[PDB]
Design a protein around this ligand. Sequence first.
Ligand SMILES: Nc1ncnc2c1ncn2[C@@H]1O[C@H](COS(=O)(=O)NC(=O)[C@@H](N)Cc2c[nH]c3ccccc23)[C@@H](O)[C@H]1O
Ligand SMILES: Nc1ncnc2c1ncn2[C@@H]1O[C@H](COS(=O)(=O)NC(=O)[C@@H](N)Cc2c[nH]c3ccccc23)[C@@H](O)[C@H]1O
Lengths: 346, 334
Amino acid sequence: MMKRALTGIQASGKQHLGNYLGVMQSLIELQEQCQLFVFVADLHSITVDFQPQALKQNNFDLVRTLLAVGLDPQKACLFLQSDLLEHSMMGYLMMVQSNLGELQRMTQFKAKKAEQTRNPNGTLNIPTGLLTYPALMAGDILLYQPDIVPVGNDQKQHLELTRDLAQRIQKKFKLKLRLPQFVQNKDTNRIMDLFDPTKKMSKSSKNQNGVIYLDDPKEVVVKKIRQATTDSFNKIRFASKTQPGVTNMLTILKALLKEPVNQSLTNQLGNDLEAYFSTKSYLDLKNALTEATVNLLVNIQRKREQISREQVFNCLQAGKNQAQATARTTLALFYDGFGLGSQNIK
Amino acid sequence: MKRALTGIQASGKQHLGNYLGVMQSLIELQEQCQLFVFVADLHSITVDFQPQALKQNNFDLVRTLLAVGLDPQKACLFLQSDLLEHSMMGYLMMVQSNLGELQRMTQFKAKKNIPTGLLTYPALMAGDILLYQPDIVPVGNDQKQHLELTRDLAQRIQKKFKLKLRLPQFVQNKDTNRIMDLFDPTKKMSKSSKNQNGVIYLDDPKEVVVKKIRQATTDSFNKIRFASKTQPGVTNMLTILKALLKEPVNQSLTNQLGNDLEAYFSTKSYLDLKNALTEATVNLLVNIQRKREQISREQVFNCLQAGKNQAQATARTTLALFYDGFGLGSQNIK
Ligand SMILES: Nc1ncnc2c1ncn2[C@@H]1O[C@H](COS(=O)(=O)NC(=O)[C@@H](N)Cc2c[nH]c3ccccc23)[C@@H](O)[C@H]1O
Ligand SMILES: Nc1ncnc2c1ncn2[C@@H]1O[C@H](COS(=O)(=O)NC(=O)[C@@H](N)Cc2c[nH]c3ccccc23)[C@@H](O)[C@H]1O
């Protein structure tokens, strides 16, 4: 039977369109085609200073967003990473099997260790979790032995490190494993920042006019898009390389039109966006983008509100058990191969 | 009743330093307080290893420990890999630490293509301790820095999360917290040491221990006395001997030498000292392996099973308290 999918999402009041288009939107297709596993990666969130109050609120808020979006706990498995000690344990086996060198060359680590304060002596103060989390990820993946791992472009190096560790583990412990395959959305694998389209939309961006947050009110969405940096070539078409700004708004618009809401918008526009905007201004593009966007956000924020606390709890409670069903099986097999545990001596 | 907690890594290289440093006092500790002792295999996989040798070593260590007096009815003896709580508690300590702090560690700084675990384990050790809110952590002198890091993390989390914490207290045997290497008395006895003649292993046969001690380096003053700075060699052999005379097996010898070793060896030679140490060490090393076989593969497993349940009890209570403090888990919603 059925092919398996695993993916994790970090919670944050900064959840944005890059996240939605990157993985969330395709979640509804996945739970129909695969045995889908999805979790709130709160063990990745605490790798930097954080407020326990904020963490709790966010973990709750993410589950509601995923539900408001269509993730069905009857068709898929949605859990909270920290609810399973199996994650910390598997993450640990991965960590002891990695070396500092490979972890230090990670691009995300470089660009992140550079995102923080220096001690009085001038040296950088880097929480250890920033260096090691990519091993936790490898473990989160391998615990469910999935066929694919749907993620955004930015997560490619991590998938590679994970396959290297899987092969490393397989070679040394002769453990029967399945190499997880990296899978990204052909079109929306990397939504760009609206202010500086040469950078991806990030929760970490200082300037917020470049990020469309999932909890941004319509008036804010309107202003941000109206100010989206374009270019002075006045030509609406897909040209990532030469017109990052316009191209970005264009591929976002295309992805939003597939949504039920926006049915009228996509009908009014036709399937050939370039042909439609052929005789129109950049302002006409921002206008259409602002409508598809507002429509989507208002419909997420709408449904997201209907989801209740109890609902979140029961959901996570069932996911916990379900996910833990396959996590224990896998960890147990690794224990055998590693020689860990006491049920290894008669 | 106060609580104690300690970990020991399994290894065919188990030596006298490990025995006098921590093992020999377990008999007393399980009587004086709530003792938790575990085989630190999570720490053993921080460097390349063989899974078969690992299960074999973990098993052997439980035997040695049982054979030396650890009573499962008076203390809790378990394998840390059996508790997922360790990996989680250690993950929390880890994310609360920083690289400089860990790069400073003498072991790492003086041991650095490096296995990631070689850098992070002091944060795991910190977690192994904190998981049981012990009053004391009985270890050898060499673990001092680790306990200092544990206290630092403890206070850091206590201030950051308002968590009700009890800082662990580093405790070492005052006379045997640092057994020195027989070849080079300025260096402590270690498993890693490449000149194996300076290290008496718990499994070293009679003729081997005889040969190692007879060759123990001394000095040229011809004075048997406690004088570590000027005479590391004889002083180390002296503190080893005195410690061994406390064991039941060396009763006859104890009566012979008396309670004042400096007085006994007053009119003797270094050869005599070596001869006494040899008799005391052999009597110990052969007694231990004797009892070691009186321990079946079954007794070990059952001991670990009970230790697991007992240990998991307080470990789970401690972890839950950390969870509600870090805002982790599903129960923190509702
Ligand atoms: N601008 C962007 N465009 C498209 N996709 C984007 C994007 N910015 C972020 N994303 C994706 O949005 C998703 C969630 O963002 S995220 O929380 O930062 N993702 C992460 O931090 C992951 N490392 C979490 C994780 C931990 N273990 C895992 C195992 C499998 C998959 C993911 C994880 C990821 O798939 C990102 O790649
Ligand atoms: N030469 C020596 N003289 C006296 N004591 C010595 C010694 N050489 C080693 N020891 C002690 O022997 C005991 C076991 O040695 S050891 O396995 O190498 N110690 C370790 O590996 C520790 N990291 C084990 C550990 C993990 N988590 C812990 C939590 C609390 C206490 C210890 C641990 C420790 O207390 C050492 O300090």
